[PDB]
């Protein structure tokens, strides 16, 4: 029985001076096709480009 949920971290810590961004990222990385280390060297090398 699950409602697998994101629980945006901030709704756990009271001193939100570290907490940042949001559940919005899991949404996004969920899409990225899992990359390899060699793969990222490339994604980064080409962004910087």
């Amino acid at each position: 029985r699950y409602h697998e949920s994101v629980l945006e971290i901030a709704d756990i810590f009271d001193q939100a001076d570290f907490i940042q961004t949001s559940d919005a990222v899991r949404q996004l990385r969920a899409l990225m096709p899992t990359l390899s280390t060699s793969q990222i060297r490339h994604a980064i090398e080409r962004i910087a480009q």
Binding site: D14, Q15, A16, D17
Partner: protein
């Protein structure tokens, strides 16, 4: 042309503001401040009794806007060129035993029959301009007010808990409060707008028993008068973060730092503006105390 019984305490002359948006009579806004104490002390000294001799009354052609101008200068936002005699030489006149120049209710100076404009009692204003004309001296070399001593007073006067600290000393208190972005300045202008004269004409007149009753009534309007005013001088002002709410933090509430640049969080005195405020306080204070 109405008498008194207390010039303030009469509709038209109400003192309100903006609490991020509302109003609230200043007493209500100052009860939202906090002071961390910090070494030192602000041993109040003695305001040097005023420079008795006031500027010569020069006719000059025009309508000297005085309520507005005095304040534009005290807690304005930059009064370009304050102290210029022009406005005060004229204001001096009002301080004579018999004249025409009536002090227009809205806050101005006229001639013979101002017409329409319901000026102030001719007597009240008489005692008023008596001192606040000298105010057009602060410019000249031999009459400067000598400001850092004066700010000692502003403090136990503004902060410093009643009695306890109303005993000559206290620690510079770094003041902070829950603000609302561009808080200090927005607040100052609600005050530039304020009707000062109503406060002074009453302060320089009211007999003696009534005067004290009055001191208590504007204890706060007056503290508020200079809180916004002192922050002009207080050194650094930054925002202290807390928990989503922001808290404006003020360097030192009492230690005038003689700074003249242009911050953003607040007003800023040009150099000559200190020459003016320093002097204005010398008078209100010598007077507040009696």
């Amino acid at each position: 042309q109405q008498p008194t019984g207390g010039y303030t305490t009469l509709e038209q002359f109400a003192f309100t503001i903006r609490n991020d948006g509302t109003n609230a009579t200043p007493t209500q806004f100052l009860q939202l401040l906090s002071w961390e104490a910090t070494e030192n002390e602000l041993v109040k000294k003695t305001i040097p009794t005023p420079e008795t001799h006031l500027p010569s009354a020069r006719n000059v052609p025009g309508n000297v806007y005085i309520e507005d101008a005095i304040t534009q200068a005290l807690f304005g936002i930059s009064a370009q060129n304050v102290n210029a005699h022009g406005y005060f030489s004229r204001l001096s006149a009002l301080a004579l035993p018999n004249t025409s120049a009536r002090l227009g209710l809205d806050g101005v100076i006229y001639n013979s029959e101002t017409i329409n404009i319901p000026f102030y009692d001719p007597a009240a204003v008489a005692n008023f301009a008596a001192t606040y004309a000298k105010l057009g001296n602060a410019s000249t070399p031999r009459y400067r007010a000598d400001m850092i001593d004066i700010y000692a007073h502003v403090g136990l006067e503004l902060a410093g808990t009643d009695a306890e600290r109303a005993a000559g000393v206290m620690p510079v208190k770094r003041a902070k409060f829950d603000s609302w972005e561009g808080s200090l300045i927005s607040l100052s202008r609600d005050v530039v707008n304020w009707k000062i004269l109503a406060f002074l004409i009453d302060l320089c007149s009211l007999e003696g028993e009534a005067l004290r009753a009055f001191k208590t009534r504007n204890r706060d309007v007056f503290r508020m008068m200079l809180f916004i005013m002192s922050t002009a001088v207080a050194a650094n002002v930054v925002n202290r973060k807390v928990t989503k709410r922001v808290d404006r933090v003020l360097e030192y509430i009492g230690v005038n730092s003689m700074r003249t640049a242009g911050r953003t969080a607040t007003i800023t005195y040009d150099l000559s503006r200190h020459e003016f405020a320093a002097k204005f306080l010398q008078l209100t204070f010598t007077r507040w105390n009696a």
